[PDB]
Design a protein around this ligand. Structure first.
Ligand code: K
Lengths: 289, 297
């Protein structure tokens, strides 16, 4: 009875057992401590190292539209993610997505639109610290990206401008914090670490938006190599450069803890209604044809 | 000392249902530790689907190692035919995200109204094939004259039909005529009705849900989205599940429900009889193979 986009909680759990105690979904730790999860008010649960989960907890989570995924996939994009399967989704959106996807020109047009959404999010979702997104250098980065997107004749061309856009923004944030930044997942520095961690939050909220509309992850708009993971990453990338990147670099520069950083992500998603934002934008991609 | 239940999916019995155990990594291998103390290894080469049923759990290490060996995990209620959580099944399990060839072909079929109608006629005829294949040692003899007249009437209507509307007409007549025959066989007055408290209607309602369950798994295993029905309305959530389940609702659910109601079974016993029939006669594989026939042609 709570709207999907109105759910405000989400979690990345480590070194604990997720189970049902006293009719509550909760996680139990080695010290005996039990912490509960508001199952009717939770967007997703991510499961990291040293975790386990029972079918009983899965049943309650799935019955309340909570998505569950594992941060280790066995291989970044190999994320194992379990969706609710018994509560049937709306049909209208996926039916329109299919017609959109099969039409190679409508698909290219949709791809350009979901790319430009990154620009819209960048100017809408701002922060009172770090990089001023309205300065001349970011304005130039945005313009070069927008014109390149407006003019491409192939998906492979779109990936070129997409790569340049993201990489240039990385360099601008690196300059702001006087660090030499190089994107690497294995890297132990807090900048890459908080980026990786924050991207799980972008993933989780993006899968949720897609599940809410019943649109399959197997129909991505941006394809080609390398561009693997499914539609969820096209959606998550909308807020990757606008929300996750500045939040991560801010946290890393202050020596913020993981707990505090994760809280800043959740707080920002709630304050700016990001889940509702993603859902509405995907739905408009889906219908206005 | 139960180890696993194997279910035939298509050509191989590569779906394992596990119950009352912890799935974990031991000695660099995925295993499941049971309450009795027994630990069993998971055969990667022979396993494609693992269903986690009642009293199960899994660690992040096991989940990770299973995925590395191309093993898909789903969560289900007891029996293994009531899945409530799983990922979507794509073309191949890791290196690419594209819909399965079955989903791709189903989509093409669904967008073409002339092919959609042809598919709708064939799934109705599958209902007839199930009626003669899946028989029972009790109740209605489906090979008597009265039932034969119902089938011939239904088959003639489906053949001559030129619209989905006409198909739905013959479909209704076929089902309620079977209701009448089973009511006549068990010598009872029966009007189909969800709001009734009698065991016959309750077992039909409950049994139909079991049929939706196994139909849901059949579509899922092929990576086919259930938002693309052939006969049920396009606005009907999970409409395709109901279309597939209708194949066995009159051949399996209907006689089992009337038999359970006649012998005064409990809800527990009734479900077990449905699940047992599903397992014994490989009903999941039956549905999967039929769905493949529809879109592969
Ligand atoms: K395998």
């Amino acid at each position: 009875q709570i709207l999907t986009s109105q759910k405000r909680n989400m979690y990345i759990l480590s070194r604990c057992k997720v189970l049902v105690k006293n009719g509550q979904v909760c996680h139990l730790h080695e010290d005996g401590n039990v912490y509960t999860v508001p199952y009717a008010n939770t967007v997703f649960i991510g499961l990291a190292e040293g975790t386990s989960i029972t079918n009983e907890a899965m049943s309650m989570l799935a019955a309340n539209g909570v998505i569950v995924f594992w941060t280790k996939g066995g291989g970044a994009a190999d994320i194992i993610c379990h969706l609710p399967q018994a509560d049937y989704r709306p049909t209208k959106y996926m039916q329109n997505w299919v017609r959109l996807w099969l039409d190679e020109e409508k698909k290219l047009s949709a791809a350009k639109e979901i790319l430009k959404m990154r620009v819209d999010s960048l100017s809408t979702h701002v922060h009172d610290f770090g990089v001023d997104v309205e300065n001349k250098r970011v304005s130039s980065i945005v313009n070069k990206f927008d014109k390149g997107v407006t003019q491409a004749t192939s998906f492979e061309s779109l990936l070129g401008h997409e790569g340049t856009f993201v990489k240039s923004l990385y360099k601008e944030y690196a300059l702001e914090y006087e660090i030499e930044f190089k994107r690497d997942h294995k890297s132990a520095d807090n900048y890459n670490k908080f980026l990786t961690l924050g991207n799980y939050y972008a993933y989780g909220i993006a899968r949720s938006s897609l599940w809410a509309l019943g649109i399959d992850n197997s129909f991505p708009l941006l394809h080609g190599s390398t561009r693997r993971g499914g539609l969820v990453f096209d959606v998550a990338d909308i807020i990757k450069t606008s929300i996750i990147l500045p939040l991560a670099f801010h946290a890393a520069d202050q020596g913020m803890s993981n707990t505090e950083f994760k809280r800043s992500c959740v707080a920002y998603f709630d304050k700016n209604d990001i889940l509702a934002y993603l859902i509405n934008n995907i739905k408009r991609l889906c219908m206005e044809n």
